[PDB]
């Protein structure tokens, strides 16, 4: 019903710039105060900026004053955040927030957020390897098979199975942050051993920062 869809996030070098967007629907956009809130990874919530219904009154956290600009296009039902001179410290998930009518700070609706990474390190697409079920699987009951998603930057990667049709028995593990600064992750499916000859198993790896979309067939042996 109420929709708050962010876009424009991504990886950027220190000193770089980005423009975030928030596409709204399901409500009379023009009668609400809109806000941006950020959250650095594993850290707390932090207010960034606010914009009044008409777009004439704006407010900013001291931490972003002079670098970030909030704006809105009421006709196009969009909230913007122009972010200039970005630094490592600005790395966070940026949430688009709708202020509850009759309040100035209370958020009734939040978006899913757009992740913004500020780093001097460049994107690295992953190398995807099949993790074939143990040689003596069809000689038993259950079989664990997977995909090793190696050496990517930054987070996240999403892993699906059989183009999203296979969801049961799927476990994508959290990534390890190696000494190299690169991540690695593994996704595993637990299937019947008897289906290993009958069923084709493919893992669908997506790493949007490097535009990587890899489909890896996982064969028994």
């Amino acid at each position: 019903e109420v929709q708050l869809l962010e876009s424009g996030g991504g990886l950027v070098q220190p000193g770089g710039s980005l423009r975030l967007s928030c596409a709204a629907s399901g409500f009379t956009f023009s009668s609400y105060i809109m806000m941006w809130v950020r959250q650095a990874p594993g850290k707390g919530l932090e207010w960034v900026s606010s914009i009044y219904p008409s777009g004439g009154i704006t407010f900013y956290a001291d931490t972003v004053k002079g670098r970030f600009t909030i704006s809105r296009d009421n006709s196009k039902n969009t909230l913007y955040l122009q972010m200039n001179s970005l630094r490592a410290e600005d790395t966070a998930v940026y949430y688009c927030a709708r202020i509850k009518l009759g309040t100035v700070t209370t958020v009734d609706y939040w978006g899913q957020g757009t992740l913004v990474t500020v780093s001097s390190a460049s994107t690295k697409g992953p190398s995807v390897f099949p993790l074939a079920p143990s040689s003596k699987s069809t000689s038993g009951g259950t079989a664990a098979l997977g995909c090793l998603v190696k050496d990517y930057f930054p987070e996240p990667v999403t892993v699906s199975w059989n183009s999203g049709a296979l969801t049961s028995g799927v476990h994508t593990f959290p990534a390890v942050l190696q000494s190299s600064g690169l991540y690695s992750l593994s996704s595993v499916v637990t299937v019947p051993s008897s289906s290993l000859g009958t069923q084709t198993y493919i893992c669908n790896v997506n790493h949007k920062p490097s535009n990587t979309k890899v489909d890896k067939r996982v064969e028994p042996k």
Partner: protein, 212 residues
Amino acid sequence: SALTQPASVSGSPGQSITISCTGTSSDVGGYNYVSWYQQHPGKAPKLMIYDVSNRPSGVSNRFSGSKSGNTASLTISGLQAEDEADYYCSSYTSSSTRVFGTGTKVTVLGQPKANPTVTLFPPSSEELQANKATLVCLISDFYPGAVTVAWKADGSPVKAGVETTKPSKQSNNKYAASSYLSLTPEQWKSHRSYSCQVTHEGSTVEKTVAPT
């Protein structure tokens, strides 16, 4: 400068816990504009309480809010496992700004001991063809979240090339962790069998893999 919340509040099932949020006379102590949010891992925050004590529609009466001086409080009665999340207060500031609290991590104890399931994969032939080798040891469905991981090459330890994650809670409310052992195809083919052995509550589960 920030709203002070305890970093951690732990509780048992069915119990009540109170999360405090202390500000100044120019924010929490100055106005009845204090809100509370619940946030689950990897999810967007959710409004639990607004205007100190008002609960939005669909929010359980197990959640209540109060204020005394420069301190706001969120009480959770009849603690449930699903209440385990991060909680934030927020208030309007006299500066016209908006400030969130430091956040409180709520942990709900009492769940039964769960032994880990260990899945060990040898390097893939594709990876070996790329002149690399990675042994993958996946540890899941354990509780409490404490594991020890040891790597062995047909006896004696392996310290070099080991990288283990911090145990993390999965969707089933149990912990999962991963450990990677990085080798050269030459090292991998030289030994008889490598082993991943994970220790959880004094009980060691071991998996072994070989070049075969």
